[PDB]
C-alpha cells in the first residue's frame, strides 16, 4: 500500500524503466499498479532511492 | 695484426707445447677467417673465459664454457691445422710442425659445412658462417 496513488504512480514510472533494462529475471515477479529474496530486495532499494530522490 | 694460417698435412708434434704464444685449431671444423676474427675480437674485448688469452682464443672458437671439450672439438689433429700466432715464431712453428701452406684449407666446402653443422649442433635456417659467429657471440650468457 501507499499513502496515495500519485506517489505510487510516480515511483512506478521511475522504477519500471530500470526494471525493463534487465531481460533475464530469476523468477516471475509482479510489478504493476534465495535468489528471489535478494532480487526483491534490489527492487525495494530501487523504489526507495526513487521516492527519497523527491 | 695477428697472423692466422691454414696448413695442410702438418706433422703434429707434442714437444711444440714445450717450446711455448700460439694456438692450434682443426682447420676443417673452424669455419673460415671470420671464425678466427670473431674469436680474436671476443678474446680481446669481451671478458676472457680462460687464464691464457692464446688458448682463450680456442675456447672462444669452441663456443661453449667448458675447456677440455673445446680442446677435443677444435683442438688440432694430425694433418691439416690452423695456426694463430703473433712472424719469426710462425716460421719456426711451420718448420717444426711442417706441412704445406694452403689458404683453401680454411674455406668452406659442402663437407666442411656438414662438419660444422654436426659439430656445433646448428639446427636452423641461416648462413653457416654467420651462425657460428652468432654461436660464439652468444657464449656470454647462462
Amino acid at each position: 500500500e501507499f499513502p496515495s496513488e500519485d506517489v505510487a504512480k510516480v515511483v512506478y514510472e521511475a522504477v519500471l524503466y530500470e526494471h525493463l533494462s534487465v531481460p533475464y529475471r530469476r523468477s516471475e515477479i509482479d510489478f504493476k499498479l534465495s535468489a528471489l529474496r535478494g532480487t526483491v530486495n534490489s527492487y525495494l532499494r530501487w523504489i526507495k532511492a526513487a521516492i527519497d530522490v523527491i | 695484426p695477428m697472423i692466422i694460417r691454414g696448413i695442410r698435412g702438418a706433422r703434429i708434434n707434442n714437444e711444440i707445447f714445450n717450446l711455448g704464444k700460439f694456438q692450434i685449431l682443426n682447420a676443417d671444423v673452424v669455419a673460415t677467417k671470420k671464425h678466427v676474427l670473431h674469436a680474436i675480437n671476443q678474446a680481446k674485448t669481451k671478458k676472457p673465459i680462460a687464464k691464457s688469452f692464446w688458448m682463450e682464443i680456442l675456447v672462444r672458437a669452441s663456443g661453449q664454457r667448458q675447456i677440455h671439450e673445446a680442446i677435443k672439438i677444435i683442438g688440432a689433429k694430425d694433418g691439416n691445422v690452423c695456426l694463430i700466432c703473433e712472424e719469426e715464431t710462425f716460421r719456426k712453428i711451420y718448420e717444426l710442425i711442417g706441412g704445406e701452406i694452403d689458404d683453401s684449407v680454411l674455406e668452406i666446402n659442402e663437407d666442411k659445412e656438414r662438419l660444422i653443422r654436426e659439430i656445433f649442433k646448428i639446427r636452423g635456417f641461416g648462413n653457416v658462417v654467420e651462425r657460428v659467429l652468432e654461436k660464439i657471440a652468444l657464449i656470454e650468457l647462462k
Binding site: - | 651462425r131 652468444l138 650468457l141
Partner: protein
C-alpha cells in the same frame, strides 16, 4: 652492413632497476633473436653483444617495417601469422608482438624480441595473441578484420593447436565487467 642497438638509461626511472631491466632485456633479446633461427624464422644476426654497455650489434635489414606495408600488402599478415605460429609451436612466447617487430624486404624477419619468454602455457600464447590484436586494431583499425583473418590463416598454416589457444583467446577477451 650492421647496426647497433642500445637500451639507454631512461632518467625518469630508478637507476638500479633501470640498469637491471636494461641488462635483462638485452640478454633476453640476444638469446631469443638467436634461438628464433632454430625454427626457420628470418631474423637479424647477432654479430656482437655487450651486456655492460647494453649495446648489441646485429645485421642491418633494409626492408619496410610490417606496420608500414602490412595493410597495403595483406600477405604480410599471413607471413606474420606463419612466423608467430612457428614461435608458439616452439613455445617461444613473444610477449610484446606488434606490427613494428617485423621487417619485410624480401622475407619477413622478426627484429625485436626484448620481452620474449619460453613457456609452454597456451594461456600465455592467447594473451600475446590478444596483445597483437590490440596493437593492430589501434594502429590500423580500418583493416583489423582482414589483417586478423590473414594472420590467423597463417597461424593455421604453420601451427596446428591454434584453435585451442584461440578458444582460450576468446575467454581472455571476456575479461570485462558484468
Amino acid at each position: 652492413d650492421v647496426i647497433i642497438k642500445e637500451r639507454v638509461k631512461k632518467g625518469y626511472r630508478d637507476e638500479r632497476l633501470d640498469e637491471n631491466i636494461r641488462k635483462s632485456r638485452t640478454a633476453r633479446e640476444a638469446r631469443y633473436l638467436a634461438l628464433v633461427k632454430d625454427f626457420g624464422i628470418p631474423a637479424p644476426y647477432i654479430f656482437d653483444v655487450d651486456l655492460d654497455n647494453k649495446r648489441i650489434m646485429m645485421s642491418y635489414i633494409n626492408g619496410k617495417l610490417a606496420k608500414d606495408v602490412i595493410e597495403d600488402n595483406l600477405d604480410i599478415a599471413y607471413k606474420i601469422g606463419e612466423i608467430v605460429g612457428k614461435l608458439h609451436k616452439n613455445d617461444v612466447i613473444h610477449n610484446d608482438l606488434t606490427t613494428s617487430n617485423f621487417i619485410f624486404d624480401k622475407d619477413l624477419y622478426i627484429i625485436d624480441f626484448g620481452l620474449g619468454k619460453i613457456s609452454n602455457l597456451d594461456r600465455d600464447k592467447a594473451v600475446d595473441l590478444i596483445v597483437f590484436k590490440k596493437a593492430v586494431l589501434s594502429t590500423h583499425h580500418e583493416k583489423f578484420d582482414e589483417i586478423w583473418e590473414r594472420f590467423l590463416e597463417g597461424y593455421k598454416s604453420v601451427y596446428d593447436r591454434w584453435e585451442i589457444i584461440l578458444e582460450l583467446m576468446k575467454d581472455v577477451e571476456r575479461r570485462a565487467r558484468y
